[PDB]
Amino acid sequence: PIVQNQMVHQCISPRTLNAWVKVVEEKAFSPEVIPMFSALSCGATPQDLNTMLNTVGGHQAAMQMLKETINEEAAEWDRLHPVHIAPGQMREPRGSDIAGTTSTLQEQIGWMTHNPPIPVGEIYKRWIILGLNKIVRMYSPTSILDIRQGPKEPFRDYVDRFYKTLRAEQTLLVQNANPDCKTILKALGPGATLEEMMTACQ
Amino acid sequence: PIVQNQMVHQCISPRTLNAWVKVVEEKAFSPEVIPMFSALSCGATPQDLNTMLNTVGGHQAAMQMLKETINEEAAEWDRLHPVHIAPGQMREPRGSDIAGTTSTLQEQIGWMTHNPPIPVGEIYKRWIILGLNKIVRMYSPTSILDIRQGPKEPFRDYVDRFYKTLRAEQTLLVQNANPDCKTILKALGPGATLEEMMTACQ
Amino acid sequence: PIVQNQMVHQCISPRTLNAWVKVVEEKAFSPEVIPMFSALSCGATPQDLNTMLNTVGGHQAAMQMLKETINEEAAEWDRLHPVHIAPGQMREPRGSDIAGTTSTLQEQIGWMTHNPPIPVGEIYKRWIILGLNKIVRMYSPTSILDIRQGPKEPFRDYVDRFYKTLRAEQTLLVQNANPDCKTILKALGPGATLEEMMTACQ
Amino acid sequence: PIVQNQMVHQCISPRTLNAWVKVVEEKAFSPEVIPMFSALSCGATPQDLNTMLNTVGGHQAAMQMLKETINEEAAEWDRLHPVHIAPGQMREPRGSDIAGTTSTLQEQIGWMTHNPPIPVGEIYKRWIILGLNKIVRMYSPTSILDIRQGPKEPFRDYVDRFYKTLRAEQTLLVQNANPDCKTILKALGPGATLEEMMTACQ
Amino acid sequence: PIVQNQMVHQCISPRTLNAWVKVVEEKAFSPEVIPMFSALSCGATPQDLNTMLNTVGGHQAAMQMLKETINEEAAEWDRLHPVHIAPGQMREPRGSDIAGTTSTLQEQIGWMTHNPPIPVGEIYKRWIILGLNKIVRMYSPTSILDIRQGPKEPFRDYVDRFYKTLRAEQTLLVQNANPDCKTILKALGPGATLEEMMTACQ
Amino acid sequence: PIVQNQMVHQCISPRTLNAWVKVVEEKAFSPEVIPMFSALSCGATPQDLNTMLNTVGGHQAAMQMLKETINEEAAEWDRLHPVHIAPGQMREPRGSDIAGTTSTLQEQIGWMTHNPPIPVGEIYKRWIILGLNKIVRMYSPTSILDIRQGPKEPFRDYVDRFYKTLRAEQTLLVQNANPDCKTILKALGPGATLEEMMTACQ
Ligand SMILES: Cc1cn([C@H]2C[C@H](N=[N+]=[N-])[C@@H](COP(=O)(O)OP(=O)(O)OP(=O)(O)O)O2)c(=O)[nH]c1=O
């Protein structure tokens, strides 16, 4: 990553490397993996981002879908930012330089610490996150339409399932509630907060 | 977070990230989670606070109740602090900027390290804590009225249950004691400290 | 805590937070918990001390006895140090400011780094330790009078039990020894060191 | 490694040492070991690279194949960069100096921090990585031609196996799919992305 | 401890605290605990040394024997260094100040960072180590005279037991060897190294 | 160790201490322990080297063989570097000073940070490593002549055993291969690389 000493390059830590590999191993593509990715890659260069993605051993279908989204984003970058070199001067990054496949670490550092910065790390991160969100959505196993409260399922447990599903996938809460709770919730009227719904079906 | 070097931004550490996720996994919304949240988010920016909340994988009913409390606090902020920009100048934060959904990290840093500081991290933290306290109270499973000393339950064990319940929920200690201990405690008279009660029913 | 860079404030570390919670979980109020508390709270502000106490999830009988001892110490402080403010000047701490319930972190820092310092962290720590020692003594399960050497119990094992009990609770060693060892120890005469006693009953 | 303070030498950390040994123990020569090697050896001197390789206890067939590839790369270096010393001056590195077998740590440091640098650490790392890629390929147990979708195997599971194999080893995806999915995929037409294939056989 | 920034005081780390408690829990008073104690207390003040000793929960017979040895060493210090104060000046340490029971942390720091230093931490450490060596010797369960090679016990295993015993306790190696190995060893003649003995009875 | 701030002394870390003790516990004197020793003792003083050796609890036969090799190396040092003191001047180290048994930490530091340095830490380390290599060789359980490929043993598994043995101990690879693989390997002709042998007997 690049952090403050000046803005300097630091090696990615074993701690970070291991945190990410273990998140992926334990959580696969549950939606909460994405903010963890984002936070573990704070200050990442593109080289660091590729490290993190490359150190994942399974899920190679997902990793190939990700390469696809990256190549689409990189093609769109190049459409909007065609590149035209001057000895000792900073060249303009192309999509593949942002994605770290045709740029050196030194180039990456030169862009990211330029004044003003060309934040290649943050641009690449957004393309990766875009890819990862597609993957989360792909691997979401259940439609929110199939999350319905069981006859002895506590409302709270049902709400947990409901919003967990909506998170991966992205009135009905009441519609999908069991008969007894639905009756209570209908009687609460419109404008009830979630808190008030949950208290009423407790 | 922002800490002293100057007040500088530092990446959230894997240690912190993992500590918080593991607290939530092991303790759910026992009341002791709140001071742990507070201490793990020392110096947090709003971006860091969202990271911590976003990395929680379960409990999405609670996470949605929290969003509600945040949006109420943010609406009250905006009622009290309407915003009116000057090139290169610091804009005034709105509720959604404090909550980190419409402000950049750079803006956040600019507010929090301003002289005088606009402590958006601490303001957001208070809204989050307000939400989390509601959640603790919601998930408290037992009324203090139902904590009563068993006939062979050691007084100390009963007192532990009593104050654990009162903590989640927020004379009777004596009223709820078993017959034998209640007699002893009545004889102690008013003004007995807890220490003296516990020694008397040992 | 406040440590040297100047004396600066630093966030409490996840390491410290977790160490303390795990000590309490594994050791409850064995006497060795107290020096561990003391060492983990090195440089603590009152806010940090409250963090550490607040992050404990069980033992709420003990935590309430502790609040009592704190309020007594704070009432005695106020009796000895009544407080009489000048714009931009440092106010004098009251008991509740020392205990961190009515003082801000900034006030705490201002007292503790004043020249000369008003060491609110160290004063509060002593009140806490006073409370914790009462708790250790309360939860000590056995009178030293009931620690007696078993007929086949190795002397060393008996001495361990004896001094472990005396530590929680706070001639007889010989009196409480078994017949065979007592005879040997009586023959050693007065002035024997513990080492010499232990060697004689080996 | 050499990192920024100046570019200074730092001892390899126990954390790094243990991370690498544990990667190798758990993952052997799965392809994801290589980027982990690369990232754990960030800033490595040749001495550090030899440390990391030497601390591996098993896999000595692989370690000897690696020595072979290193000696070939070192022989090619010497062919392209023959060496011709001046008291107190920096000598030119030979292959065996790059590989750290005939150079001291001090020499290594002198090359790597020279202006301009003679990046012996990065040159050696590339030879090692070249060797490790041969080893990954050797130990790849399955031809991509033998990865075929089972009749009840979910497409996603089959794609994972397919790209995992291709990664170790380095139209057919459709050819190797089961009859039912192959029919769907043929109907999608050419130019389908992987995402669209995976959605169609879901 | 006191370490270099100036010589400054630093809080004892949770890492150190936990390392020591775990050594004692796992190893009791095997002789190898002593060098670990020494290395974990590098730069320790007397306050730190007391912390480390006080955080041990079991072994209170040993801890009381240690207090005895400390009080003897402290009495001998006072015999050799009687103390005779000048406002704002450094007083001379007595035994009990060296052992940290009557000296403050500030006094300790003032002695240890004086020019020239009065190394109270190192003096106390030597008294502690003296005590701990007595304890190691006390708890050594076996005389070296009872370590004899079994008829099918590998020589190496026997030598391990022999020198392990001698270490706790502090020609015969040959005398205590089994008949077959003793014959071989007698034939080797005098002046054989241990290496040569071990090779001969392999 | 001594590392860069100036070259300053730093305490050995609990991390290092524990890493070494655990390596020895898990790996005994497999050859890979030696490079781990070397890397964990980077910058070690002789005092640190003795710490590391002294903290090992088992293997006291090996530890005594090591003392022997050290005393031989130290006797050879003294033969080549006899010592002839000037108030406030640096004395010349004898073998026993290099091995840290008759030199103080301060002396050690004075030698190692002298300009030019008298690298007592590196000299002692080489004597230790010399000893440890003898120990590795002693405890190597099998002659390379007894490593022969089983009739259903995969060639790769056999090569692993072969080079693992050669490493502890320090044409035949083909001679010791099973009949079927030996035939293939004979047909490959001379000059085959290990890679080509392994591919041919796959
Ligand atoms: C002793 C022991 C530790 N662990 C883990 C628990 C801990 N997880 N986290 N932290 C690790 C210790 O690594 P940790 O102390 O976190 O080291 P690091 O992350 O490098 O931080 P620093 O060195 O303090 O700067 O080992 C275990 O799983 N089982 C065990 O028996």
Side-chain angles (χ1 to χ4, degrees), chain A residues 8 18 23 36 46-47 61 66 98-99 144 160 166-167 173 179 191 193:
Chain A
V8 310
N18 182 60
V23 175
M36 185 65 80
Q47 181 194 55
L66 185 58
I98 290 166
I144 198 64
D160 283 338
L166 211 70
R167 194 192 190 174
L173 186 68
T193 63

PDB file of all heavy atoms in Angstrom, chain A residues 8 18 23 36 46-47 61 66 98-99 144 160 166-167 173 179 191 193:
ATOM      1  N   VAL A   8       4.515   7.126   1.232  1.00  0.00           N
ATOM      2  CA  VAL A   8       5.505   6.100   0.880  1.00  0.00           C
ATOM      3  C   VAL A   8       4.861   4.727   0.636  1.00  0.00           C
ATOM      4  O   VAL A   8       3.853   4.436   1.208  1.00  0.00           O
ATOM      5  CB  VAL A   8       6.619   5.960   1.944  1.00  0.00           C
ATOM      6  CG1 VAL A   8       7.210   7.338   2.280  1.00  0.00           C
ATOM      7  CG2 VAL A   8       6.149   5.263   3.196  1.00  0.00           C
ATOM      8  N   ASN A  18      -3.210 -12.730   5.163  1.00  0.00           N
ATOM      9  CA  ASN A  18      -3.846 -13.898   5.798  1.00  0.00           C
ATOM     10  C   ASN A  18      -5.327 -13.622   6.130  1.00  0.00           C
ATOM     11  O   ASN A  18      -6.187 -14.450   5.867  1.00  0.00           O
ATOM     12  CB  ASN A  18      -3.034 -14.268   7.004  1.00  0.00           C
ATOM     13  CG  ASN A  18      -3.586 -15.485   7.678  1.00  0.00           C
ATOM     14  OD1 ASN A  18      -3.663 -16.555   7.069  1.00  0.00           O
ATOM     15  ND2 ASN A  18      -4.108 -15.290   8.869  1.00  0.00           N
ATOM     16  N   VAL A  23     -10.922 -14.715   5.266  1.00  0.00           N
ATOM     17  CA  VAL A  23     -12.313 -14.209   4.995  1.00  0.00           C
ATOM     18  C   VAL A  23     -12.978 -14.984   3.865  1.00  0.00           C
ATOM     19  O   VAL A  23     -14.118 -15.458   3.966  1.00  0.00           O
ATOM     20  CB  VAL A  23     -12.323 -12.727   4.546  1.00  0.00           C
ATOM     21  CG1 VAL A  23     -13.729 -12.254   4.141  1.00  0.00           C
ATOM     22  CG2 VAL A  23     -11.845 -11.824   5.640  1.00  0.00           C
ATOM     23  N   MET A  36     -15.160  -5.928   3.798  1.00  0.00           N
ATOM     24  CA  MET A  36     -13.927  -6.406   4.371  1.00  0.00           C
ATOM     25  C   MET A  36     -12.811  -6.283   3.342  1.00  0.00           C
ATOM     26  O   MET A  36     -11.724  -5.833   3.670  1.00  0.00           O
ATOM     27  CB  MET A  36     -14.073  -7.850   4.850  1.00  0.00           C
ATOM     28  CG  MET A  36     -12.842  -8.366   5.564  1.00  0.00           C
ATOM     29  SD  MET A  36     -12.472  -7.504   7.133  1.00  0.00           S
ATOM     30  CE  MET A  36     -13.618  -8.284   8.235  1.00  0.00           C
ATOM     31  N   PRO A  46      -2.434  -1.141  -7.362  1.00  0.00           N
ATOM     32  CA  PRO A  46      -2.982  -2.201  -8.184  1.00  0.00           C
ATOM     33  C   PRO A  46      -2.236  -3.525  -7.989  1.00  0.00           C
ATOM     34  O   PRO A  46      -2.881  -4.604  -8.004  1.00  0.00           O
ATOM     35  CB  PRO A  46      -2.790  -1.651  -9.592  1.00  0.00           C
ATOM     36  CG  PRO A  46      -2.945  -0.174  -9.411  1.00  0.00           C
ATOM     37  CD  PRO A  46      -2.249   0.107  -8.128  1.00  0.00           C
ATOM     38  N   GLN A  47      -0.912  -3.459  -7.825  1.00  0.00           N
ATOM     39  CA  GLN A  47      -0.138  -4.654  -7.543  1.00  0.00           C
ATOM     40  C   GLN A  47      -0.686  -5.344  -6.281  1.00  0.00           C
ATOM     41  O   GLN A  47      -0.828  -6.577  -6.269  1.00  0.00           O
ATOM     42  CB  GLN A  47       1.332  -4.320  -7.403  1.00  0.00           C
ATOM     43  CG  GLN A  47       2.184  -5.546  -7.124  1.00  0.00           C
ATOM     44  CD  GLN A  47       3.587  -5.206  -6.648  1.00  0.00           C
ATOM     45  OE1 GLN A  47       3.810  -4.475  -5.659  1.00  0.00           O
ATOM     46  NE2 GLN A  47       4.515  -5.729  -7.326  1.00  0.00           N
ATOM     47  N   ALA A  61     -14.216 -19.927 -10.865  1.00  0.00           N
ATOM     48  CA  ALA A  61     -15.328 -19.399 -11.672  1.00  0.00           C
ATOM     49  C   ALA A  61     -15.599 -17.944 -11.373  1.00  0.00           C
ATOM     50  O   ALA A  61     -15.619 -17.145 -12.265  1.00  0.00           O
ATOM     51  CB  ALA A  61     -16.604 -20.205 -11.418  1.00  0.00           C
ATOM     52  N   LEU A  66     -14.790 -12.143 -12.438  1.00  0.00           N
ATOM     53  CA  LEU A  66     -14.147 -10.900 -12.083  1.00  0.00           C
ATOM     54  C   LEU A  66     -13.185 -10.294 -13.154  1.00  0.00           C
ATOM     55  O   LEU A  66     -13.159  -9.064 -13.360  1.00  0.00           O
ATOM     56  CB  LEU A  66     -13.496 -11.109 -10.726  1.00  0.00           C
ATOM     57  CG  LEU A  66     -12.857  -9.880 -10.083  1.00  0.00           C
ATOM     58  CD1 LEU A  66     -13.921  -8.813  -9.950  1.00  0.00           C
ATOM     59  CD2 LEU A  66     -12.273 -10.268  -8.737  1.00  0.00           C
ATOM     60  N   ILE A  98      -3.996   0.520 -14.975  1.00  0.00           N
ATOM     61  CA  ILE A  98      -4.811   0.636 -13.779  1.00  0.00           C
ATOM     62  C   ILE A  98      -5.026  -0.729 -13.111  1.00  0.00           C
ATOM     63  O   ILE A  98      -5.017  -0.828 -11.882  1.00  0.00           O
ATOM     64  CB  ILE A  98      -6.158   1.314 -14.123  1.00  0.00           C
ATOM     65  CG1 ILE A  98      -5.894   2.797 -14.446  1.00  0.00           C
ATOM     66  CG2 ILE A  98      -7.146   1.168 -13.019  1.00  0.00           C
ATOM     67  CD1 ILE A  98      -7.101   3.447 -15.132  1.00  0.00           C
ATOM     68  N   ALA A  99      -5.284  -1.734 -13.928  1.00  0.00           N
ATOM     69  CA  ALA A  99      -5.484  -3.109 -13.417  1.00  0.00           C
ATOM     70  C   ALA A  99      -4.164  -3.785 -13.071  1.00  0.00           C
ATOM     71  O   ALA A  99      -4.167  -4.951 -12.770  1.00  0.00           O
ATOM     72  CB  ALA A  99      -6.252  -3.923 -14.459  1.00  0.00           C
ATOM     73  N   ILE A 144     -36.002 -13.107  -2.470  1.00  0.00           N
ATOM     74  CA  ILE A 144     -36.753 -12.573  -1.381  1.00  0.00           C
ATOM     75  C   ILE A 144     -38.240 -13.014  -1.360  1.00  0.00           C
ATOM     76  O   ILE A 144     -38.849 -13.082  -0.313  1.00  0.00           O
ATOM     77  CB  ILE A 144     -36.676 -11.059  -1.368  1.00  0.00           C
ATOM     78  CG1 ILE A 144     -37.085 -10.522   0.001  1.00  0.00           C
ATOM     79  CG2 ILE A 144     -37.528 -10.427  -2.486  1.00  0.00           C
ATOM     80  CD1 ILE A 144     -36.185 -10.919   1.153  1.00  0.00           C
ATOM     81  N   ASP A 160     -34.294 -11.365  10.176  1.00  0.00           N
ATOM     82  CA  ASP A 160     -32.898 -11.639   9.877  1.00  0.00           C
ATOM     83  C   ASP A 160     -32.732 -12.295   8.544  1.00  0.00           C
ATOM     84  O   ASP A 160     -31.900 -11.854   7.767  1.00  0.00           O
ATOM     85  CB  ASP A 160     -32.223 -12.514  10.933  1.00  0.00           C
ATOM     86  CG  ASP A 160     -31.851 -11.757  12.199  1.00  0.00           C
ATOM     87  OD1 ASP A 160     -31.725 -10.507  12.141  1.00  0.00           O
ATOM     88  OD2 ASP A 160     -31.566 -12.453  13.236  1.00  0.00           O
ATOM     89  N   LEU A 166     -32.239  -9.913   1.137  1.00  0.00           N
ATOM     90  CA  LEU A 166     -32.297  -8.677   0.399  1.00  0.00           C
ATOM     91  C   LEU A 166     -30.901  -8.062   0.151  1.00  0.00           C
ATOM     92  O   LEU A 166     -30.602  -7.508  -0.946  1.00  0.00           O
ATOM     93  CB  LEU A 166     -33.129  -7.663   1.139  1.00  0.00           C
ATOM     94  CG  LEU A 166     -33.893  -6.650   0.351  1.00  0.00           C
ATOM     95  CD1 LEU A 166     -35.068  -7.294  -0.424  1.00  0.00           C
ATOM     96  CD2 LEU A 166     -34.426  -5.617   1.354  1.00  0.00           C
ATOM     97  N   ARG A 167     -30.062  -8.140   1.163  1.00  0.00           N
ATOM     98  CA  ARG A 167     -28.674  -7.697   1.020  1.00  0.00           C
ATOM     99  C   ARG A 167     -27.905  -8.449  -0.075  1.00  0.00           C
ATOM    100  O   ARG A 167     -27.271  -7.790  -0.848  1.00  0.00           O
ATOM    101  CB  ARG A 167     -27.923  -7.826   2.330  1.00  0.00           C
ATOM    102  CG  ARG A 167     -26.593  -7.064   2.344  1.00  0.00           C
ATOM    103  CD  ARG A 167     -25.821  -7.527   3.594  1.00  0.00           C
ATOM    104  NE  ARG A 167     -24.694  -6.609   3.685  1.00  0.00           N
ATOM    105  CZ  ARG A 167     -23.842  -6.607   4.711  1.00  0.00           C
ATOM    106  NH1 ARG A 167     -24.017  -7.428   5.699  1.00  0.00           N
ATOM    107  NH2 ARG A 167     -22.826  -5.790   4.701  1.00  0.00           N
ATOM    108  N   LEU A 173     -42.442  -7.517   3.620  1.00  0.00           N
ATOM    109  CA  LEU A 173     -42.125  -8.052   4.967  1.00  0.00           C
ATOM    110  C   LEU A 173     -43.377  -8.472   5.698  1.00  0.00           C
ATOM    111  O   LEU A 173     -43.429  -9.551   6.294  1.00  0.00           O
ATOM    112  CB  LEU A 173     -41.345  -7.004   5.794  1.00  0.00           C
ATOM    113  CG  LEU A 173     -40.828  -7.495   7.183  1.00  0.00           C
ATOM    114  CD1 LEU A 173     -39.754  -8.516   6.971  1.00  0.00           C
ATOM    115  CD2 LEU A 173     -40.306  -6.337   8.006  1.00  0.00           C
ATOM    116  N   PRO A 179     -49.497 -15.953   9.424  1.00  0.00           N
ATOM    117  CA  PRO A 179     -50.852 -15.378   9.639  1.00  0.00           C
ATOM    118  C   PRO A 179     -51.043 -14.542  10.931  1.00  0.00           C
ATOM    119  O   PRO A 179     -51.601 -13.444  10.905  1.00  0.00           O
ATOM    120  CB  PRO A 179     -51.717 -16.655   9.693  1.00  0.00           C
ATOM    121  CG  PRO A 179     -51.033 -17.574   8.692  1.00  0.00           C
ATOM    122  CD  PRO A 179     -49.558 -17.376   9.051  1.00  0.00           C
ATOM    123  N   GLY A 191     -46.712   3.292   8.178  1.00  0.00           N
ATOM    124  CA  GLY A 191     -45.761   4.114   8.900  1.00  0.00           C
ATOM    125  C   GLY A 191     -45.103   3.489  10.120  1.00  0.00           C
ATOM    126  O   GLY A 191     -44.331   4.159  10.783  1.00  0.00           O
ATOM    127  N   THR A 193     -42.353   1.645  12.180  1.00  0.00           N
ATOM    128  CA  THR A 193     -40.936   1.465  11.984  1.00  0.00           C
ATOM    129  C   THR A 193     -40.698  -0.046  12.115  1.00  0.00           C
ATOM    130  O   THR A 193     -41.560  -0.778  12.610  1.00  0.00           O
ATOM    131  CB  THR A 193     -40.128   2.189  13.041  1.00  0.00           C
ATOM    132  OG1 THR A 193     -40.430   1.639  14.330  1.00  0.00           O
ATOM    133  CG2 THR A 193     -40.350   3.701  12.982  1.00  0.00           C
TER     134      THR A 193
END
